[PDB]
């Protein structure tokens, strides 16, 4: 049982081509969703900062975005992560606020029945 990496330049170009069709389908929105900033859970890397999965419910409510719409404007949700330190709430709320600063939202046509 042996594996060869001859398709390594083939697979990389397939991935790039897979990104370009995604960009074609969804033009204005970025090819990647926003991710939060979290700290690795170990004494070795705890002083580091990296990306998370999504923004917890305290990070959404504090920033001012409901949890239902957040999934629609590209902000992802992590029901499992929680905020134990306020610096973790702060680094990710401002991460949301800077995102909503640059976020153009296209209006959608809405059904308007004659009566009500």
């Amino acid at each position: 049982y042996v594996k060869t990496w001859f398709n390594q330049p083939g697979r990389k170009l397939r991935r790039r081509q897979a990104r370009q069709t995604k960009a074609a389908k969804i033009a204005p929105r970025p090819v990647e969703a926003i991710r939060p900033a979290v700290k690795p859970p170990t004494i070795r890397y705890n002083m580091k900062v990296r990306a998370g999965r999504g923004f917890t419910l305290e990070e959404l409510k504090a920033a001012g975005v409901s949890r239902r719409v957040a999934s629609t404007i590209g902000i992802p949700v992590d029901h499992r992560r929680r905020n134990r330190s306020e610096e973790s709430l702060q680094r990710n709320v401002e991460r949301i606020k800077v995102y909503l600063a640059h976020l153009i939202v296209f209006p959608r046509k809405a059904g308007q029945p004659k009566k009500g």
């Binding site: 049982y1 042996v2 594996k3 060869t4 990496w5 001859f6 390594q8």
Partner: protein, 166 residues
């Protein structure tokens, strides 16, 4: 309302009510064929909570397997092979005695338009689910092959991945 009460009456399987029923039901089931249709589930609340809904296309078959591979996992392979067209949803214990285990197996008709048009049970019409009792993709199949999240739950070892630049 009722399936709360039926939940805790089925939790005591050696009490007099159940043991008196275990003898009465096992005697009459052995009188029947090995695999036979059942109109209403012998355990309505268990069939309910396992996915069964009282509507057309939902079927139930009762099977006895000799004691002495899993017994319940067997009941699913034998029922499905009997009803070749139905997709097996689930299975549950109904009764047992000294020489047999009686199992009920729920099946779905992939062709019935009450099922095919049901937004929630549509997933079973897809061919990838052909005979899930045969591949080990049911609940007991998932358990009997040790699939799950945990620390208590091959070729990645033997392989020799030689990268392009090595």
């Amino acid at each position: 309302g009722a399936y709360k009460y039926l939940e805790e009456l089925a939790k005591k399987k050696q009490s007099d009510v159940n043991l008196f029923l275990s003898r009465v039901r096992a005697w009459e089931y052995r009188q029947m064929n090995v695999i036979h249709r059942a109109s209403r589930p012998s355990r309505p609340d268990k069939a309910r909570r396992l996915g069964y809904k009282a509507k057309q296309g939902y079927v139930i078959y009762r099977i006895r397997v000799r004691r002495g591979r899993s017994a319940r996992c067997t009941a699913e392979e034998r029922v499905g092979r009997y009803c070749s067209n139905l997709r097996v949803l689930n299975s549950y214990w109904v009764n047992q005695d000294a020489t047999y285990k009686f199992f009920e197996v729920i099946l779905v008709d992939p062709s019935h338009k009450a099922i095919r048009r049901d937004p929630r049970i549509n997933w079973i019409v897809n061919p990838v689910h052909k005979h899930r009792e045969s591949r080990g993709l049911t609940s007991i199949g998932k358990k009997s092959r040790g699939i799950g999240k945990g620390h208590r739950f091959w070729l990645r070892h033997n392989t020799l991945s030689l990268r392009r630049y090595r």
